[PDB]
Design a protein around this ligand. Structure first.
Ligand SMILES: Nc1ncnc2c1ncn2[C@@H]1O[C@H](COP(=O)(O)OP(=O)(O)OP(=O)(O)O)[C@@H](O)[C@H]1O
Ligand SMILES: [Ca+2]
Ligand SMILES: [Mg+2]
Lengths: 128, 363
């Protein structure tokens, strides 16, 4: 707004076509997860997941899930929440937002991972 | 470029650097000037020199009431507390829920015109606390110095039509502890004495799960009594005052107020929101602020909200240990995000649009 426009490269990539996109919060930034690692979540980290589905008239349906590992730091869970709001705003408020806590994820979220999601210990260091 | 975060409390200012997990400087929001006939002091030094200064608190209920004094606080915060030149740093400031329009503009005008900040942003305190808890939806019960706010938030934005307030918070609880301690024969009336009462409140008070039952217990034995050593060395005994003091949050009639207690205020805010989001508010009640620090408060909120809500509604009270600083921490995270740079009001924008840009950039 005013003199500024959304320029974050990952926002520009977000929700352009039907599919699943996953980013990890890394030191106050939103970093894409390599597609071959989708579904393998570090319990020490927080992630943002965007599921894009094509509707009948060709518009896109969005569900934004922010996934919070049992051991993720406060900067990571806070950043995951804020990036979720920001991405929804960028997507014209068209996304339903979902808080996903490790071990308590919604059936919808779990259903994104055909072979079942997996947990692994560790993750990227806190930005604090 | 290093952003600053300033949480302007009515009683205490919290100031520091975005990306830090805690404010570097926490000090009284006070300006002192010569009592009779350096022109001014701020913060701890003003409080210490109170014998020769008249003290002013420019923020009341989270709202700035004296801009000359507020400007002195900000000048002190930058130059003395943080040891920065504010012309070199984006600054994130916090504001009370429902801060008047003219006040948001004045804050903005001061930052750009007085301090020449290259960029600034204004965020609602309760919203920062919600973000600090890792949530985008919930209801924040934010209770500090003079006011307790209940602020429902959905998918990152406060619902202004549903924000309520109880005009009772920590300073009133301190004053009430002072009053009830007189019943036992302990007169605390001076500033140093009031500081002792505040310490008794912060160290020994707690919220009873069942107030009536607690009063019965107190009256039937010395089980709940505690000793407190005064600075001189004298030892006093505190009994039911321990839980009667914060009971006023739930029963404002203790202070001669007709207002509903904090649990009811929270319920009332929830009921002002769209029926379709109420589940998410009950399931995400976040406590924030110094006056939410009483042991037992989360258990009591859970009990009271459970009684008000339908039995099948899941109530969850979130009461983080760091909640005295949740607002500041939420600001520190927000101001650190790679996307922040795209959100602030820039000097260039202010020069083109003037103070009213704050309503278009910050909401
Ligand atoms: N452990 C504690 N138990 C009870 N009360 C506490 C505790 N610690 C601090 N407080 C009270 O918290 C109050 C200050 O809270 P806080 O710093 O959140 O308010 P503020 O930011 O100054 O004001 P506001 O947010 O209302 O403008 C004081 O009354 C203080 O005595
Ligand atoms: Ca991590
Ligand atoms: Mg405050």
């Amino acid at each position: 707004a005013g003199h500024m426009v959304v320029e974050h490269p990952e926002f520009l990539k977000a929700g352009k076509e039907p599919g699943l996109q996953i980013w990890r919060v890394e030191k106050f930034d939103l970093v894409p997860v390599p597609t071959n690692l989708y579904g393998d979540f570090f319990t020490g980290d927080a992630y943002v997941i965007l599921k894009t589905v094509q509707l009948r008239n060709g518009n896109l349906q969005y569900d934004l899930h922010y996934w919070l590992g049992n051991e993720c730091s406060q900067d990571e869970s806070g950043a995951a929440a804020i990036f979720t709001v920001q991405l929804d705003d960028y997507l014209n408020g068209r996304a339903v937002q979902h808080r996903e806590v490790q071990g308590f994820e919604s059936a919808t979220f779990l259903g994104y991972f055909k072979s079942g999601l997996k947990y692994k210990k560790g993750g990227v260091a806190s930005g604090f | 470029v290093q952003a600053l975060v300033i949480d302007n409390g009515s009683g205490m200012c919290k100031a520091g650097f975005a990306g830090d997990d805690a404010p570097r400087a926490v000090f009284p929001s006070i300006v002192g000037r010569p009592r009779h006939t350096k022109d001014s002091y701020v913060g701890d030094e003003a409080q210490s020199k109170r014998g020769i200064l008249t003290l002013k608190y420019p923020i009341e209920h989270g709202i700035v009431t004296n801009w000359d004094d507020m400007e002195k606080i900000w000048h002190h915060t930058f130059y003395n507390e943080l040891r920065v030149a504010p012309e070199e740093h984006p600054v994130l400031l916090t504001e009370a829920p429902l801060n008047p329009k003219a006040n948001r503009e004045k804050m903005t005008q001061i930052m750009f015109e007085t301090f020449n900040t290259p960029a600034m942003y204004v965020a609602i305190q309760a919203v920062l606390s919600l973000y600090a808890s890792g949530r985008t939806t919930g209801i924040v019960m934010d209770s500090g110095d003079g006011v307790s706010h209940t602020v429902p938030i959905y998918e990152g934005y406060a619902l202004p039509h549903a924000i309520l307030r109880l005009d009772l918070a920590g300073r009133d609880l301190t004053d009430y502890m002072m009053k009830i301690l007189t019943e036992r024969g302990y007169s605390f009336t001076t500033t140093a004495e009031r500081e002792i009462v505040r310490d008794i409140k912060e160290k020994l008070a707690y919220v009873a799960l069942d107030f009536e039952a607690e009063m019965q217990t107190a009256a039937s034995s010395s089980a709940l009594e505690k000793s407190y050593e005064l600075p001189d060395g004298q030892v006093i005994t505190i009994g039911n005052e321990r839980f009667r003091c914060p009971e006023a949050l739930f029963q404002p009639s203790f202070l001669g107020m007709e207002s509903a207690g904090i649990h009811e205020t929270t319920y009332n805010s929830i009921m002002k929101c769209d029926v379709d989001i109420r589940k998410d508010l009950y399931g995400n009640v976040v406590l924030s602020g110094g006056t939410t620090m009483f042991p037992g408060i989360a258990d009591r909120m859970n009990k009271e909200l459970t009684a008000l809500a339908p039995s099948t509604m899941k109530i969850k009270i979130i009461a983080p240990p760091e909640r005295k600083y949740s607002v500041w921490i939420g600001g520190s995270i927000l101001a650190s995000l790679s996307t922040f740079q795209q959100m602030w009001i820039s000097k260039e924008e202010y020069d083109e649009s003037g103070p009213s840009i704050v309503h278009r950039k910050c909401f």
